[PDB]
Every structure is written in C-alpha cells, then in structure tokens.
Amino acid sequence: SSHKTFRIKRFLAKKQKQNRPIPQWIWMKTGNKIRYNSKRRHWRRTKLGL
Amino acid sequence: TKGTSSFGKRRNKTHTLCRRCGSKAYHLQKSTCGKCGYPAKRKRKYNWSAKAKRRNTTGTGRMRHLKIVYRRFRHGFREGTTPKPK
Amino acid sequence: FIVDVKANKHQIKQAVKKLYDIDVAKVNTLIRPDGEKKAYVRLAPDYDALDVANKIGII
Amino acid sequence: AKIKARDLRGKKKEELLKQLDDLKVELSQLRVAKVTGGAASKLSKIRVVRKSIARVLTVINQTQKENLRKFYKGKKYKPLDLRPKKTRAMRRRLNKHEESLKTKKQQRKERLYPLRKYAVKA
RNA sequence: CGCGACCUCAGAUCAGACGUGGCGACCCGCUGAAUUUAAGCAUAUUAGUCAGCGGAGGAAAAGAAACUAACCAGGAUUCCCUCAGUAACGGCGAGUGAACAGGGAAGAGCCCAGCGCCGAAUCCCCGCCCCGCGGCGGGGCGCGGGAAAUGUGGCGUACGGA
RNA sequence: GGCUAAAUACCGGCACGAGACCGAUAGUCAACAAGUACCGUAAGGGAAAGUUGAAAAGAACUUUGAAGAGAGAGUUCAAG
RNA sequence: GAGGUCCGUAGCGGUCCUGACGUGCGAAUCGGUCGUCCGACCUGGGUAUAGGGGCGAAAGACUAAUCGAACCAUCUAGUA
RNA sequence: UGAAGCCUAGGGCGCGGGCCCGGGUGGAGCCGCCGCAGGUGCAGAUCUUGGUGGUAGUAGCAAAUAUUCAAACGAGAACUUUGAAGGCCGAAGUGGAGAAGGGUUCCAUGUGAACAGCAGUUGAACAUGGGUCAGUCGGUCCUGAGAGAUGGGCGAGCGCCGUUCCGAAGGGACGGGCGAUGGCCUCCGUUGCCCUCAGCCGAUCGAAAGGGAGUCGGGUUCAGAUCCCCGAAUCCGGAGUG
RNA sequence: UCCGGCGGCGUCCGGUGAGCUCUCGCUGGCCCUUGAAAAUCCGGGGGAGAGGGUGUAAAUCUCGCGCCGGGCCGUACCCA
RNA sequence: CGACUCUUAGCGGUGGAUCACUCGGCUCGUGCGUCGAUGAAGAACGCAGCUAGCUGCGAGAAUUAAUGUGAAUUGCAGGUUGAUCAUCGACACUUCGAACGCACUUGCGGCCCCGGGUUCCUCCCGGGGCUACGCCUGUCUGAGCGUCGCU
Ligand SMILES: [Mg+2]
Ligand SMILES: [Mg+2]
Ligand SMILES: [Mg+2]
Ligand SMILES: [Mg+2]
Ligand SMILES: [Mg+2]
Ligand SMILES: [Mg+2]
Ligand SMILES: [Mg+2]
Ligand SMILES: [Mg+2]
Ligand SMILES: [Mg+2]
Ligand SMILES: [Mg+2]
Ligand SMILES: [Mg+2]
Ligand SMILES: [Mg+2]
Ligand SMILES: [Mg+2]
Ligand SMILES: [Mg+2]
Ligand SMILES: [Mg+2]
Ligand SMILES: [Mg+2]
Ligand SMILES: [Mg+2]
Ligand SMILES: [Mg+2]
Ligand SMILES: [Mg+2]
Ligand SMILES: [Mg+2]
Ligand SMILES: [Mg+2]
Ligand SMILES: [Mg+2]
Ligand SMILES: [Mg+2]
Ligand SMILES: [Mg+2]
Ligand SMILES: [Mg+2]
Ligand SMILES: [Mg+2]
Ligand SMILES: [Mg+2]
Ligand SMILES: [Mg+2]
Ligand SMILES: [Mg+2]
Ligand SMILES: [Mg+2]
Ligand SMILES: [Mg+2]
Ligand SMILES: [Mg+2]
Ligand SMILES: [Mg+2]
Ligand SMILES: [Mg+2]
Ligand SMILES: [Mg+2]
Ligand SMILES: [Mg+2]
Ligand SMILES: [Mg+2]
Ligand SMILES: [Mg+2]
Ligand SMILES: [Mg+2]
Ligand SMILES: [Mg+2]
Ligand SMILES: [Mg+2]
Ligand SMILES: [Mg+2]
Ligand SMILES: [Mg+2]
Ligand SMILES: [Mg+2]
Ligand SMILES: [Mg+2]
Ligand SMILES: [Mg+2]
Ligand SMILES: [Mg+2]
Ligand SMILES: [Mg+2]
Ligand SMILES: [Mg+2]
Ligand SMILES: [Mg+2]
Ligand SMILES: [Mg+2]
Ligand SMILES: [Mg+2]
Ligand SMILES: [Mg+2]
Ligand SMILES: [Mg+2]
Ligand SMILES: [Mg+2]
Ligand SMILES: [Mg+2]
Ligand SMILES: [Mg+2]
Ligand SMILES: [Mg+2]
Ligand SMILES: [Mg+2]
Ligand SMILES: [Mg+2]
Ligand SMILES: [Mg+2]
Ligand SMILES: [Mg+2]
Ligand SMILES: [Mg+2]
Ligand SMILES: [Zn+2]
C-alpha cells in the first residue's frame, strides 16, 4: 500500500536488502559448503507474511 | 460460494507485529498478543506445549548479559583491580 | 547527501554549515527504500554548488 | 602513524579532542572516496582510521571516569555507575560487619564455655 | 476569635532506600479432571495425579514433643534397609494401604513474649574531624534532630529461674 | 510465638569424564546457513539436506559449434 | 404526482434447461432462460457478541473450504 | 604383492538354512574357534520413506469474431520491433486515475542455464545499476458506536467488575499585598509566599470515506511532482525596544 | 550540434436547447422512522478597570504595509 | 533372413542401496550451582574494502583498553617500541521489552540549565539532566462541629 507506516517500511527495507544473491569470492574459501543462497524469495511465490 | 469465491474478500488483516516478541500475532481489536499476551505484565506460557516453550526461552537469543555473567562467575565477580602492569 | 534517519532538517543544515562553511537555503528529506535518509540541500544563491562539489571532492 | 593508547595517556584533553576531530575529518574524506570509487589503499585505510577513533575515545572515557572515581573516593553517596555492579542478590546481601556482629548473651556464652581440644586414650 | 499540644488522615519531581519481570530439572502452597479398571455402571480406581495459579533457594521443606510407648522403656528433624503388601480401608468387589519398635547415614541445639529488677540503662538519621573503603564500617564531637513509657536494651524461658 | 547446619532431591544452567549405546530412513526434530526453509488469520505445525583427491594438481592448448555440448591434449596411481 | 405500485437497466439473487463441465477455467464455475430493482433496499470501513458458547424473518442454518457442538496443544502410545 | 562391499553362461559342498574357492570391480580394514549379550533373519499389514514402470509420445494444449504483407536486428522469426492493411473493445470500456492488499513487481542496460505448459531476439524471469523531495495532499488534532486505567469492590490467585459509580479527584488565573532578582533597577519579566476567583463528567484510546485554517498556473525526468525550477499567492505562530 | 534558440503570424464573431453531468437556490411531500458528537472559532449582554490633562499628547487598535519561522512520518508502481 | 516379442550375458544409462568412515546424538556419573529498575530474558534494527545466510558485535558496532603469547590473517586486494590468537579485571553498550513523562502513530508534553536567536525580550533551533506505580523510615506543607489547654 502507498499509505505505509514507518515500522512496516523499515521491515520491507531490511528484507529487500536481504533478497540479494551470494558473492562469488565466498565460493572459493577453504571450508566452504555453500553453493547458492537458499533463502531467496520471489515477490509472487512467497508472500512475506504480514 | 463457500470456497473459492469467498477467498476473494480476504483483504484486511486481523493481526500485526507486536513489540515484545515481534511475531505477527497482535490482535488489533483485542489489542493483545496471541503468543505472549503483550498488555499483560507476565509472559504467556503454558505447560501443554513443550515445543512452544522451547521455541523461545533463555538459551535461544543472544545472552547479552547472561553469558558475561557466566564468564564473570568463573572468576568470582572481580572489580576495581586490573592485572599487574607490564 | 545521505544521512541517518534520526536527523532533523535543522540539524542537517547546521551540520552542513559547520562542515562545509556554506550557507543553506533549504532542505528536502526522504527516507529511501534502502533505509537511509536522502537529503537535498539547496544553497544560498551567492554560493556555487559545482564549486563546493569540487572542493569536497565529488564530481 | 600508528596511533597507540600508551603515548595518549599522558596527553591533555584538549589535544585529545583536536586529534579526534582530525581523525574524524580524515574518515569523512575516506568515505567520500569510497562512495565515489577510489583506491584499495584508501578502502583499506578506513578501517585503521575507525580503530584510531575507537582508541582515542576509549582513552578519553577511561581518563574521565578515573578522575571521577578519584573525586568520589571519600564521599558516602556516589553515583550508581561508580557503585559496584555485582549481582543483584549480592548487592542485597548483608554486609561484612553486620553479618559478623553478634548478641551479648551468646557471646557471653562463648566466653564462659569455649570449645575445648581433647583426646581419649585408646 | 486566635494561639498550642495530641490523635487520626492527606499531598509532594521532598532525603535515602526497597518490590515488580525471567528461568523453573529439583522444592513449598492452593486448585484439580477425564480417558482407564471394575469385562456394563453410578460409590470406588485412575488420583491429591495431568492441565491451571502463586512463591523461592543452591537445595527447599521439616525440626528440638501438647512424641512414641505400656517395656527392666526410648528421646528433635531428614534419608536408606526392614517392618510390609502387613494392621487397616473397600458395590468387603475391583482394588488400595501406613505407623511403632530394630539396624544404619548425619548428629547441634537455641531465642522471645509473658512474671520481675535495673534513673530508657535502647535505637535511627543529619553536620563536622581523623581512619578505612568497591560488602559504607571504626573512633570522637555537636544545650543537633527524631523513635520510644500504647515499652527499647541488659538479666532471664520450663533442662526450672531470680 | 520464633530461629536452626549435616546427612536428602536435581531430564533446566556453567564446566567436565566415561559407555558391551546409534551410525546419516539410525541417533535429539536438528552431524549440514535447524526450530532454518516452508504452511496457517492465529494458537501453533515443521522438513529434505554428510563423503572428489594425499595435495586443486579443478582439465592450459588445438579443433567443430551461437552455446550447451563433443573430439583430441594434459594432471593424477586412479577421471574406470 | 402518492404507492413496502407495475414493465425494465446497473446492482442484488439464483428458477428451469434436471443444458455445458464433471482426473473442470473452477474443492460449486459457464451459457441461455429467470426473480426483484425507493425499499423489511444494496454496499466499504469501524465496532460488539466465542464453543455446550455466540448469532439465527428458524433450514439444526452460519460461526476462516470444518458444525446435530469449531480449531490448536496436552492427558494420550486413551479403550477395543 | 590388496580388507570390507558389489557383479559373475566359472568349479564345488551341504536334504536345507547356507557356505567355500576362481575371475572382475573396488581402495582400508576383516575373520575362525571357546564363552557372553541382543533394537538379530520379511512377501504381504488399503505397512513407512525413497525410487522406477505399463498406461503413453496417450488424454489433452477448443469460453469471450481475426489476422495478412514488407523491412530491420539477429546464428536462428507463425509469435520481437517499425510501417501499411483488415478487425475488436465502444465512454455501466479491453480507456484514464485512486482505496484495501502486494512490496520493488517501477526505469534503464545486459543475458538467454532454469521459469513464462509451443517458441522466443521478448518478460512482472536472472544479473548489474538507478528511482519516492511538502507550512498550504494525508497522518498527526476531535469525538462517535465502543474500548480502558486510578479511587472502590470482588477475587485462593494470575487478575476481574466497573467508567462516575462508596475519592480530600484543581497544581490554574485577572488582580492585590509581601520578599528577591536582572536589565540605563525606570518599568516590566522571571519568579518565591500570602489574599481573592475557579463545576466538571471524569485519565487515556477510538475514523488515511465523518469534523478539521491555509496553493494555484506554466515548465522539467528514464523513473518523482498541487512536493523539483520559475511566477503568482495564502494561513498559523512570534516579535523588549513595537 | 550542446538549444525553456531566434523569429514571424494567429489565438475571431454569434445562436440555441423538456438536451446530459455537476452545483447553487426555492418550494412541497413521507414518517407510531424526525434523521451524530466533540475539537475549534465567533458575536452579543454586562461594566470590575486603564489611560492624559490640552500635548512632542497617553492607554488602546479585528486598519495598511514591513520582519522571522513552520519540525516528524507517508509519497515509486499494480489495482485486475 | 528382416521387424516386433521373450530369456541370458557384456558394456552403457537412471537410481542411490550396501560397505567403510563421523568436529553429531543418547545414557550414566562428577564438580559447581551464578539473572533483573546499576534496567534482565526475549525481540527489532544496524556494523565487514569486496558480505546474502550463520557467527560475533552496538554509532568506540566481525570490536577498544589491559594481561599472557610471540610473527601472522589469507578467497582476492592494502599497508619485535609487538601481527595474530587467547584471557578478560578497564571503558563503552542503538530502539522496544517488568519498561518508567502521557500514548504507542513514533505523535504530544512540562520543568531546570547550557550553546546558537537573543545580545533576557520573549519567541525559534541544538544539546544536557529530571518528570512511572506501590511501599518503608525520616522532612516539609496541611486538614478535622476528633480529644483537649491558655484566652
Ligand atoms: Mg497471488
Ligand atoms: Mg475483526
Ligand atoms: Mg508466568
Ligand atoms: Mg535477651
Ligand atoms: Mg526524591
Ligand atoms: Mg479435590
Ligand atoms: Mg468399564
Ligand atoms: Mg472392557
Ligand atoms: Mg462403557
Ligand atoms: Mg463411574
Ligand atoms: Mg483419591
Ligand atoms: Mg502441574
Ligand atoms: Mg517472581
Ligand atoms: Mg538464584
Ligand atoms: Mg529452611
Ligand atoms: Mg522453619
Ligand atoms: Mg520444649
Ligand atoms: Mg521416629
Ligand atoms: Mg514377609
Ligand atoms: Mg489412594
Ligand atoms: Mg524408627
Ligand atoms: Mg554413625
Ligand atoms: Mg522488656
Ligand atoms: Mg511454647
Ligand atoms: Mg515450638
Ligand atoms: Mg571410570
Ligand atoms: Mg540420510
Ligand atoms: Mg535424521
Ligand atoms: Mg542419504
Ligand atoms: Mg548409506
Ligand atoms: Mg539415507
Ligand atoms: Mg555420496
Ligand atoms: Mg579407483
Ligand atoms: Mg416495486
Ligand atoms: Mg417489479
Ligand atoms: Mg437451487
Ligand atoms: Mg446438469
Ligand atoms: Mg466429459
Ligand atoms: Mg454467556
Ligand atoms: Mg436474515
Ligand atoms: Mg458432543
Ligand atoms: Mg582413502
Ligand atoms: Mg544393539
Ligand atoms: Mg529388511
Ligand atoms: Mg520388501
Ligand atoms: Mg504428438
Ligand atoms: Mg493427440
Ligand atoms: Mg482457454
Ligand atoms: Mg481502468
Ligand atoms: Mg494507467
Ligand atoms: Mg519493466
Ligand atoms: Mg515453454
Ligand atoms: Mg476492565
Ligand atoms: Mg486520538
Ligand atoms: Mg480524519
Ligand atoms: Mg458595555
Ligand atoms: Mg503516484
Ligand atoms: Mg543373473
Ligand atoms: Mg552412500
Ligand atoms: Mg553488510
Ligand atoms: Mg587490543
Ligand atoms: Mg598485545
Ligand atoms: Mg493514533
Ligand atoms: Zn507478542
């Protein structure tokens, strides 16, 4: 909604920042088990709660 | 009209996020939290849900003060003094 | 500029005046969807924004 | 160069503040370089500048509160921050004197009948 | 009318303190079922148990007989073995059910009120001086202020006491 | 009317030591970014997921193809 | 120019074809045909009523696809 | 100088449960005998979990009239874009804009592994970067249906009832007096004390559709405009010396 | 080219309507239905008081200009 | 002959059983046995040169000081008088939360004091410190046709 509140806007800001993929240089560490970000979220599939 | 066409009228929400536990369980007309009972002073907690007790308890969060208390108890709560200067 | 969410327009203009010794006409602020507070600071006409930008180092 | 907290203890608060201000100015310039796109050298030095900020502020705070404790050393009523922060139960606990002082009746009993040290032949 | 005590009762962002909430394996106090068994079921059983509420500690609770006994008598509390699946309870059905004595672990006893006698002999706080200080205490000084006779302190408590 | 250690209890907590226990459909739901992803208005419900090699030495280079993808070549004891 | 008045749009509803579909577009939809359409009218938001309780122009109807007693966890690995 | 495991038209033993050799693959442990212990032998339980078939390249990809030509880019065009032609929506719209809800889907650049039930040079897909500016639009203020503290009562208890009901429920004020202060101690102000005056209907919450002063025109972006720039206004509050 | 570039010209004169939509106003009907509160602002009645002694006038002005300020949050897009 | 179908074997796929591993569980035992208005548990948001999650930390924000240790961290960069690790007693510790100025939009305040405005003349701006409920001891100011005494 265009008529947001401040708490909700901060919440959306944090998850918008979280929704980025993984940097490539981490895939090259010594003890690395991570191959892709499994906590991704698409705006149409998963509806974020709220 | 019992199902699919009545699912379309769901457009205003009955719960929001609350200030104690941050879960989306704060009923807006009751003005209480269904998970912690926010307006009440005491935490909502029951013995018929061991899982609910485990989901948020003392060992779950950050232990910001309590782990320091542990580390200080291992030495007896020293204060005032500092190790011998070099 | 971009600032933290706690700053007032008065606080922002006072800070700009102290750090960059420039007079300020007005300030417009908006909280960006990333989270910070973008502030558009319009100067007094007798200063030059391009000159001040070169002085600061952004260009 | 390498600002370290051992040659900063003997200084005076006014040049401490001036040095802090200079370090803050340098940090602001470094952040400007970061956002505009700069050298890996500056991008690395921003951490050093931040830690210099941290240790200068630490020295200031430590000296200030140390002088403040020296000031409040003798007085009976002192701020809660300067009071000892042990656990709440230990602050509620009886103090060393009154946990030791005893009644006249049973101290008289103790002095009249002290516990003896004896042994019994096999 | 006014003034002054006292008694009751208010108001303070008055000076200095204290409680709230969390965890909750163990503990203390209330509240408290129904599945189930009885080859049905209603008393009984499940069970003073689950769920619910309150309150702590490093343990808690209990504890120094208004006791057990009937002996040639034992002697605070708590725990273990036994007493004992016993005396007893029970549509005397299903089922439930202790205690004393005996042997060990541990071992520790004490204080008031009241009756009385000592010139309130008692306690708290403020200010000042010296000392100590991260458990705010020691000494001294205040024709300093209060509490207290509608009872503070010393002696003294059933083993008697003055 | 009141106080009182010891012997006693301890599936939570801070550290520890051990086992005729289990061995990734087992053992805690969770050996892994697990009370995580995810579903529900909510109270709550709740996973799947371990192994290259001694060492990345993780396949330079030529070649066909838009590329995936192949043919040679090469590393390794082994690319079976 | 009156009327819980008539025909008839939007809206509100849901007769008949017992039409379409019936591993559907769909865990109740589609077409034509229909009822009413100034009133006991239709509708958003706010607000109150909670489970042996609510609310019901009353069909045991509705109470989050669940109702002749909702849903969640527990007693519970309930009894056969 | 090759253990476990696995495969085998190889050789055998045992009535049988089973077992021993040979070959191959594999790369780090394993077995016989005497006793001991058990979460100890599967074909079934509309058994549990995981995987794979026939069905089968089958059903199906049929609601709402409709497409054709040329060119461009491109490795590649029934589906992209440009132009032309023919149609539809038909102002109770397939148009232009908001509320709830969604939360970056908005804009640009690039890609064609996966997804968009054919394909794609396209995309609400993926990867990089950008983007929301207010005294005069709304919230904030008011109270409505209602919700909710304190006094009080009840309650084993968490707490509940109750909203003017069993309260000493006001911390304000013109002025007058006293006391001090600053400013050319003028006159006022800050105050400190006293005199005098004083019903509130009950703290507080409750509407982005109710109540509620005051902003409009032109231009500007890729994506923002009663918000930015220009030009015209206007409201509220304040102001010793006015 | 990088242009709120430079220029000319023009932006005209009339009539109609039970027309449609919006709005302002008057009047009537209907009710055993009478169709919100509060913040806020204003006017009036009263006359406690104040101002100066004829001036360089005083108190006082809802008159005309002049001076300063207006913080916090929302604002992209979709709306089928 | 051939196609198609059936069986067996070799090789190749799909699939991930078995075997061997194991920084994980479960069970028993030992010692200790410590939260909070000096603001807990929990939650929210932020902090890395390149950083999503996990971990750590709090505007001094993948940490400061001090002590011990003694030459690294490392995926890529960068530049011994003490790098890095550990210990941890100094210092610091955002917003909610018993949560405390009133409400919970982050809105509206009041009081005292500083620095701008001012040149105290008030406004306006920034900063700092207070402003919750109950309850105890004492203090001050009070009330009563409550009990009295002097007038
Ligand atoms: Mg959807
Ligand atoms: Mg509702
Ligand atoms: Mg509780
Ligand atoms: Mg005595
Ligand atoms: Mg006080
Ligand atoms: Mg009972
Ligand atoms: Mg029976
Ligand atoms: Mg039976
Ligand atoms: Mg029966
Ligand atoms: Mg019965
Ligand atoms: Mg019973
Ligand atoms: Mg219980
Ligand atoms: Mg408690
Ligand atoms: Mg404790
Ligand atoms: Mg005890
Ligand atoms: Mg006791
Ligand atoms: Mg006795
Ligand atoms: Mg006994
Ligand atoms: Mg026997
Ligand atoms: Mg019984
Ligand atoms: Mg005995
Ligand atoms: Mg013994
Ligand atoms: Mg006495
Ligand atoms: Mg007695
Ligand atoms: Mg007794
Ligand atoms: Mg041993
Ligand atoms: Mg597994
Ligand atoms: Mg498992
Ligand atoms: Mg597996
Ligand atoms: Mg396996
Ligand atoms: Mg497995
Ligand atoms: Mg594997
Ligand atoms: Mg091999
Ligand atoms: Mg009609
Ligand atoms: Mg009709
Ligand atoms: Mg029908
Ligand atoms: Mg049909
Ligand atoms: Mg069919
Ligand atoms: Mg009822
Ligand atoms: Mg009805
Ligand atoms: Mg029933
Ligand atoms: Mg190996
Ligand atoms: Mg076994
Ligand atoms: Mg098997
Ligand atoms: Mg089988
Ligand atoms: Mg086909
Ligand atoms: Mg076909
Ligand atoms: Mg279709
Ligand atoms: Mg439209
Ligand atoms: Mg549009
Ligand atoms: Mg787009
Ligand atoms: Mg496709
Ligand atoms: Mg209430
Ligand atoms: Mg309000
Ligand atoms: Mg409004
Ligand atoms: Mg008059
Ligand atoms: Mg818009
Ligand atoms: Mg075979
Ligand atoms: Mg395996
Ligand atoms: Mg980061
Ligand atoms: Mg350091
Ligand atoms: Mg060091
Ligand atoms: Mg509000
Ligand atoms: Zn909550």
Distance from C-alpha of A8 to C-alpha of D12, rounded to nearest angstrom: 48
Token digits for B66?
């309590």
CA distance B27 to B34: 7
SS3 category, D44: helix
Find all residues with CB under 8 Å of D52, minimum gap 6, and list them.
Answer: D3, D23
Handedness of CA B16, B22, B24, B29 (dihedral sign): negative
Resolution in A: 2.8
Neighbours of D91 (CB within 10 A): 10
List chains adjacent to chain A, taking adjacency as at least 3 C-beta pairs closer than 8 Å. B, C
Instruction: Return phi, psi of residue B45, to 5°.
Output: -165, 135
- H or E element, residue C57: none
Tokens of D57: 């502020």
Please report which helix (H) or strand (E) contains residue D33, including its range.
helix D13-36
φ and ψ at D72, to 5 degrees?
A: -85, 15
Approach to solving: cryo-EM
Binding site annotation covers B18?
yes
The CA D99 to ligand 25 mean position distance, Å, reads: 26
Residue entry with tokens 């020295």: D59
Q: H-type helices in chain B, by residue range? A: 50-55, 66-73
Does D37 lie at the interface with C, CB-CB under 8 angstroms? no
Residue B81 has phi, psi (to 5 degrees) of -85, 165
- Whether D33 has its CB under 8 Å from any CB of chain C: the answer is yes
D5 in Cβ contact with D58 (< 8 Å) = yes
CA of A1 to the centre of ligand 49 (A): 18
Determine the Cα–Cα distance for residues D56 and D62; give it in Å rounded to an integer.
10
Burial class of residue D52 (count of CB atoms within 10 Å of its CB; 0-12, 13-18, 19+): buried
Q: Give the span between the Cα atoms of D69 and D22, in whole angstroms.
A: 30
Give the span between the Cα atoms of C2 and C4, in whole angstroms.
Answer: 7
> B4-7: long-range contacts at Cβ-Cβ below 8 A with a sequence spacing of 24 or more?
none
- Identify the H or E element spanning A26: none
How many C-beta atoms surround the C-beta of residue A1 within 10 A? Answer: 5
Strand H–CB A11 distance below 7 A: no
Contact C17, C6 (CB under 8 A): no
Q: How far: B11 CA to E10 C1' (Å)?
A: 56
Radius of gyration (C-alpha) of chain B in whole angstroms? 22
CA distance D60 to D50: 16
- What is the CA B50 to C1' H44 distance in angstroms? 39
Number of helices (H), then strands (E), belonging to chain B: the values are: 2, 3
- C56: chain D residues, CB-CB within 8 Å: 32
Q: What are phi and psi of B32, to 5 degrees?
A: -135, 160
Q: Which residue from D29, A31, A12, D70 is spatially nearest to C31, judged by alpha carbons?
A: A12
End-to-end CA distance of chain C: 13
**In b/e form, how buried is each residue of C6-35, taking b as 16+ CB within 10 angstroms?**
ebeeeebbeebeeeeebebeebebeeeeeb
